[PDB]
């Protein structure tokens, strides 16, 4: 019933689906070594991934797809989704990344890892950019769902063609929802289309960061297809 | 001058800036040699195209090099995908070099990138992407991919957005259809970024700033 929802019903459902903010393992050895910091971040990321699977099932349109296609979208999007979440909760802490409420890290602590500092900087710039745009929570949840639905759709017979157009219609509905929030907020038609484009252009930088992130992770714990398909069935 | 242009003047300037379609001059090496020769020749035309994108020449030479360093492969890729639209299941690298999926297997690891390029081409075919929309998307890539210089870039991007909406309104689309199509085109740019990052990784598996800064000064 995702194509029959209004803009306000889409927002309400995405806000209800929103996963909880988690904490890192309490009182680890401080200061950090390269391994210890990666261990705590990896533990946190894995626990968030369990909540992401459950979030994804409550994104309208996603559950209508086949289990194979749900796994494919999540396999393509999981690190982008982790990253936009991080960047969102770091908005109110300029020069810092709020990995958890008990794990607020500045740029200099990123140097502890080796190659992480470049990715750190990109995440901070994006956070700063969301701060400058005054990004709203309602807009945030729409952007997250876009990432999930958009990131794997291009790399997907009758079945797959019907699944692809279904995804494209859901994305059209999220666009409508984004415009409605901006019109309800009071922005002019010109300001609405400009802000929409600004938000969607930021998603290309998020993809870039996610690809750099993967390369950095493989240089040193990444969810496989089989792992994600096991988790989805539960 | 770029902030004072109308939607129609933006389109006319981008269409005038458009580079020419070039010709090429198999083993894994021989195919990569011909593709690399072609890519290098197109890169000379891209530098000159970039200088004629309204807003780009106002930036410093350092910032022009940075935008091009970040965007060159995305720009090469959207060009390829655009000229392949009318050849389903094939990539038109040049008019004398039309390659299907199976010839991508000749170079190891290329076939995955081949597939992504074909899917994007197919997606532009399904959207009935227009030449006027294409040139706007290309300029977006250049300006978006890489304090007064930053806000200048953001204003130029706002003008290209306006231009995109105007083309859709002039084409007859409703306000709802206009914002949906705008979003659809911009979402495709994330896949182009992805392809470009995969492309780089693949290129470094086989094989600069200074080179691009040298070319820009000419
Ligand atoms: O006209 C075209 C249009 C598209 C392409 C194309 C030619 O050829 C090649 C190509 C060759 C060399 C390059 O870079 C070589 C290195 N350059 C020269 C500088 C070093 F001195 C950087 C860059 C690209 C090509 C495409 C498709 C998109 O990008 C690719 C990704 C791949 O994984 C494999 C091949 C390509
Ligand atoms: C973005 C990110 C990580 C990250 C990854 C690469 C580079 C970087 O700077 C940060 C790193 C991470 C570590 C291990 C895995 I498996 C996945 C993410 O730790 C995180 C924890 C929570 C979260 O919401 C995001 C991240
Ligand atoms: Ni509108």
UniProtKB/Swiss-Prot annotation, chain B:
Where 17beta-estradiol binds, per the record, is at: 42, 83, 202
Membrane-crossing residues? Answer: none
The record's tissue-specificity note reads: Widely expressed. Not expressed in the pituitary gland.
Question: Where is the protein found, in the record's own terms?
Answer: Nucleus; Golgi apparatus; Cell membrane
| Alphabetic keyword roster | Activator, Cell membrane, Cytoplasm, Disease variant, DNA-binding, Glycoprotein, Golgi apparatus, Lipid-binding, Lipoprotein, Membrane, Metal-binding, Methylation, Nucleus, Osteoporosis, Palmitate, Phosphoprotein, Receptor, Steroid-binding, Transcription, Transcription regulation, Transmembrane, Ubl conjugation, Zinc, Zinc-finger
- Any single biological process term in GO: epithelial cell proliferation involved in mammary gland duct elongation
Q: What is the effect of changing residue 53 to E?
A: Has higher transcriptional activity in the absence of wild type ER. Inhibits transcriptional activity when coexpressed with the wild type receptor
Annotated region Transactivation AF-2: the residues are: 6-218
Q: Where is the lipid attached (S-palmitoyl cysteine)?
A: 136
Its domain comment says: Composed of three domains: a modulating N-terminal domain, a DNA-binding domain and a C-terminal ligand-binding domain. The modulating domain, also known as A/B or AF-1 domain has a ligand-independent transactivation function. The C-terminus contains a ligand-dependent transactivation domain, also known as E/F or AF-2 domain which overlaps with the ligand binding domain. AF-1 and AF-2 activate transcription independently and synergistically and act in a promoter- and cell-specific manner. AF-1 seems to provide the major transactivation function in differentiated cells.
Tell me its family: Belongs to the nuclear hormone receptor family. NR3 subfamily.
> What is the name listed in the Swiss-Prot or TrEMBL entry for this protein?
Estrogen receptor
């Amino acid at each position: 019933l995702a194509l029959s929802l209004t803009a306000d019903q889409m927002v309400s459902a995405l806000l209800d689906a929103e996963p909880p903010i988690l904490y890192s393992e309490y009182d680890p050895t401080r200061p950090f070594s390269e391994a210890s910091m990666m261990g705590l971040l990896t533990n946190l990321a894995d626990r968030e991934l369990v909540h992401m699977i459950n979030w994804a099932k409550r994104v309208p349109g996603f559950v209508d797809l086949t289990s194979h296609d749900q796994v494919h979208l999540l396999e393509c999007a999981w690190l982008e989704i982790l990253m936009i979440g991080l960047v969102w909760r770091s908005m109110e802490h300029p020069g810092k990344l709020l990995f958890a409420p008990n794990l607020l890290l500045d740029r200099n602590q990123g140097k502890c890892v080796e190659g992480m500092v470049e990715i750190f900087d990109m995440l901070l710039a994006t956070s700063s950019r969301f701060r400058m745009m005054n990004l709203q929570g309602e807009e945030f949840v729409c952007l997250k769902s876009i990432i999930l639905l958009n990131s794997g759709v291009y790399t997907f017979t009758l079945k797959s063609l019907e699944e692809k157009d279904h995804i494209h219609r859901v994305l059209d509905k999220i666009t409508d929802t984004l415009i409605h929030l901006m019109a309800k907020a009071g922005l002019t038609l010109q300001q609405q289309h400009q802000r929409l484009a600004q938000l969607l252009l930021i998603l290309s930088h998020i993809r870039h960061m996610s690809n750099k992130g993967m390369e950095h992770l493989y240089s040193m714990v990444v969810p496989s297809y089989d792992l994600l398909l096991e988790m989805l069935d539960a």
